Design a protein around this ligand. Structure first.
Ligand SMILES: [Cl-]
Ligand SMILES: [Cl-]
Ligand SMILES: [Cl-]
Ligand SMILES: [Cl-]
Ligand SMILES: [Cl-]
Lengths: 350, 454
């Protein structure tokens, strides 16, 4: 309660019509729309408040869509999805999309016309609005956009070759910089402020520098198999979560040791995401269908104790076929969050 | 066996000279005996009117002597009793089945806004017999429904000039003209003509492009032929329903790069977040009110360009309504599940108990103090603003708290022996509520316009 408000308490909207588990959730940069990747190989775009599905496409006949991520720019409306080895760039049909905004996005994707091969996809895909198919060498787990949306990185765990790939959307250029990682890469994240980079293995999270190309720091969370992480918008803190049921707040100001360790979960933590856009909230997702919503506040002053308290646990996702909540994203402004569970549902919490 | 009562009321046409003063003294009398005393040949000479009684701002659900034993107060005190017309409960009557979700409902009645707007001019001046009910669907289709629940008219489809996508809101601006808006960013004005046999025709008069984004909300003025809209672009639109006076469209919003296409007069973006609701002021038609997810209710001057006042609230606002003092009082539906009653001049009270987002409101056609809301929790709830308690401690803040007088569920769900409502709004979500004298029609996710009346 107290100064810790507001936070999500109850689930206000249920998102249905996926068959089999929903692997991903990404909220539109403007905050009016939801994107869900399915195990049924469908990417879909839904009206946030109502839960009406305004757009859908099936990228590959048989495959799961692991990650969907919006291009973090309000002047574009471009969605990225990862199906197996292929990452597709598309422009969903939405009320937001006018002929001007459409032509703008098309101008961005079409501009720029092997670690990766950039190809125009089948006719049927632009018939449904998917402008690009980018193929890397082994299956894509994670997608992360750089804040100005020109670069995006794909992480493919199995193949060491393509493991961490940085793509340039301007030149249509896939690259495998800071080539060999000593590890098995789970995922990666760009830095909110300075041109830095983050690559998490099962081991540890490592912060690099892009065109100096140098390893800057390495933080060791000290847990079995890092499942995921997310970077505070402040950039000076991040949060990791694992299959150990434990959540680790890392203060990069102080140490490589985790600042705080938190056990709120019965089973593995499969997703962790901060609230970007300035509210002192973060959350983790579990293989029990619960989300754990924490308040934590990066101090106004540098090098000061972050204050972290759990505010609320959200149940109501159904543990289905051995798995719980698989993903989380936050609303850009408001303290609402959306989760992707194995119910075949996505759910909105306020 | 002796208790002093004194009668007061806000009711416009029911009032006692001089007889307010005197003692009711069985002391065990439920609201019933008092409602009988008021109805007395001596008092109001009405004689059947059910009256509810408010002490302190709270309804009396027990006898008098019990009330003034259990609280305190068997002081021989004179309890001051407000008396109000007891709500006639809007029980279930009919359901109009749809193919997809019902986004919007409006009612054409002799005494409805479009009905009174009609009889001025042009004018059908709809007869007491035939009322028409408008429903907008995520089909992309408007439907003009019979009072008895048959479909008189159906809008054209995509091709042939209809909407190209789902319709978010639609209303009657008169019996000839009606207006709609939706995910296709157009606002469309329709001619509605009806034949001797009961069948309709909806012919689009006007396609209006100002908006880049979904057009979520729409309000109308049938006198001045004006429309105004609220859209996800965070901008409030202002339009003429008349083909006659319109600017020419932007053309970069049009389907490129028969029916007439025109633009907005005075389209403004005053909001940081999407704009959820925009309404005309009841007294002055050049004054409008906006509400958005940016937490603001803005008093807006349509004569000049833009905003004369801004009022900020705790949570994002999904809806707005005016209650008629020379000027209104706003109900603001919130994503925080409660309704804040706002005074736009330089937060009176809070209606609580919806379990989900509150997306639709509408004032009682009967009295000022009554209101019906509708919400994503699957229910529409009826409030009386004369019912007020000093705020509870938890989450209460300033004393505003008012609970619902009556609760209206979906006959979709309620007809089942099921116990508690489905989590979130699942299947039951209520998108639109309008309250007429036929009364309380409810559109939503269950694909039904629902009729509740006494
Ligand atoms: Cl679809
Ligand atoms: Cl194909
Ligand atoms: Cl379920
Ligand atoms: Cl013309
Ligand atoms: Cl309830």
């Amino acid at each position: 309660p107290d100064e810790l408000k507001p936070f999500p308490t109850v689930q206000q909207t249920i998102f249905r019509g996926h068959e089999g588990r929903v692997r991903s959730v990404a909220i539109d940069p403007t905050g009016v729309a939801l994107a869900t990747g399915g195990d049924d190989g469908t990417v879909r775009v839904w009206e946030l408040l109502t839960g009406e599905q305004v757009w859908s496409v099936k990228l590959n006949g048989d495959e799961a869509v692991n990650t969907v991520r919006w291009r973090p720019t309000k002047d574009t409306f471009i969605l990225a999805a990862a199906a197996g080895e292929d990452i597709f760039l598309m422009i969903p049909t939405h009320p937001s999309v006018t002929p001007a905004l459409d032509q703008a996005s098309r101008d961005i994707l079409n501009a720029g016309f092997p670690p990766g091969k950039w190809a125009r996809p089948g006719t049927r895909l632009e018939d449904e609005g998917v402008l690009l198919r980018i193929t890397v060498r082994s299956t894509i787990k994670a997608i992360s956009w750089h804040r100005r949306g020109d670069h995006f990185a794909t992480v493919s765990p199995s193949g060491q070759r393509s493991s961490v790939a940085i793509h340039t959307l301007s030149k249509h250029l896939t690259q495998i910089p800071f080539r060999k990682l000593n590890g098995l890469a789970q995922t990666a994240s760009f830095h909110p402020l300075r041109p830095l980079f983050f690559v998490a293995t099962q081991r540890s999270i490592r912060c690099y520098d892009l065109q100096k190309l140098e390893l800057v720091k390495i933080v060791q969370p000290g847990a079995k198999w890092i499942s995921s992480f997310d970077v505070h918008p402040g950039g000076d803190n991040l949060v990791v979560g694992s299959y150990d049921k434990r959540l680790l707040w890392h203060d990069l100001d102080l140490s490589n040791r985790p600042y705080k360790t938190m056990r709120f979960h019965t089973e593995a933590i499969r997703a962790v995401r901060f609230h970007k856009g300035g509210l002192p909230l973060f959350a983790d997702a579990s293989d029990d269908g619960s989300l754990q919503i924490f308040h934590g506040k990066v101090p106004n002053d540098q090098l000061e104790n972050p204050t972290i308290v759990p505010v609320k646990m959200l149940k109501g996702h159904k543990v289905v076929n051995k798995l719980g909540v698989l993903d989380i994203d936050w609303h850009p402004r408001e303290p609402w969050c959306v989760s992707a569970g194995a119910d075949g549902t996505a759910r909105l919490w306020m | 066996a002796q208790v002093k009562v004194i009668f007061t009321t806000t009711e416009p046409d029911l009032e006692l000279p001089e007889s307010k003063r005197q003692l009711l003294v069985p002391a065990d009398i439920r609201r019933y005996g008092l409602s009988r005393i008021l109805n007395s040949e001596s008092m109001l000479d009405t004689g059947s009117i059910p009256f509810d009684f408010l002490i302190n701002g709270s309804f009396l659900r027990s006898s008098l002597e019990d009330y003034l034993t259990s609280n305190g107060l068997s002081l021989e005190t004179t309890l001051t009793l407000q008396y109000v017309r007891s709500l006639i409960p809007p029980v279930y009557e009919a359901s109009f089945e749809h193919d997809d979700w019902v986004s919007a409902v409006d009612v054409l009645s002799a005494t409805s806004p479009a009905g009174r707007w009609s009889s001025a001019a042009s004018s059908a001046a709809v007869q007491p017999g035939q009322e028409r009910v408008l429903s907008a669907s995520y089909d992309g289709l408007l439907r003009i429904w019979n009072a008895s629940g048959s479909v008189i008219a159906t809008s054209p489809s995509g091709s042939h000039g209809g909407h190209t996508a789902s319709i978010k809101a639609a209303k009657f601006l008169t019996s000839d003209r009606l207006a709609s808006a939706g995910m296709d960013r157009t606002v469309r004005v329709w001619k509605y003509t009806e034949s001797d046999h009961f069948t309709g025709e909806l012919k689009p008069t006007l396609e209006l492009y100002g908006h880049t984004g979904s057009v979520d909300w729409l309000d109308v003025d049938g006198h001045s032929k004006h429309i105004l809209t609220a859209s996800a672009d965070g901008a409030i639109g202002f339009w003429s329903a008349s083909k006659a006076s319109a600017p020419e469209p932007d053309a970069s919003l049009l389907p490129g790069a028969s029916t007439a296409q025109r633009g907005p007069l005075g389209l403004w973006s005053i909001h940081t977040a999407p704009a959820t609701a925009a309404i005309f002021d009841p007294r002055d038609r050049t004054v409008a009110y906006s509400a958005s997810q940016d937490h603001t209710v803005r008093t807006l001057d349509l004569t000049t360009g833009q905003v004369v006042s801004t009022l900020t609230l705790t949570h994002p606002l999904l809806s707005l309504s005016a209650l008629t003092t020379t000027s209104p009082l706003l109900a603001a539906g919130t994503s925080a599940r409660h309704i804040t009653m706002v005074d736009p001049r330089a937060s009176v009270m809070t209606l609580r108990g919806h379990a989900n987002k509150v997306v639709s409101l509408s004032p009682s056609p009967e009295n000022e103090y009554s209101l019906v809301s509708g919400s994503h929790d699957g229910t529409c709830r009826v409030w009386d603003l004369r019912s007020v308690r000093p705020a509870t401690k938890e989450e209460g803040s300033l004393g505003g708290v008012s609970e619902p007088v009556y609760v209206i569920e979906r006959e979709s769900w309620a007809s089942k022996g099921k116990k508690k409502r489905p989590v979130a709004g699942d299947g039951c979500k209520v998108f639109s509520v309008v309250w007429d004298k036929l009364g309380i029609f409810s559109g939503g996710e269950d694909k039904k316009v629902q009729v509740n009346r006494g």
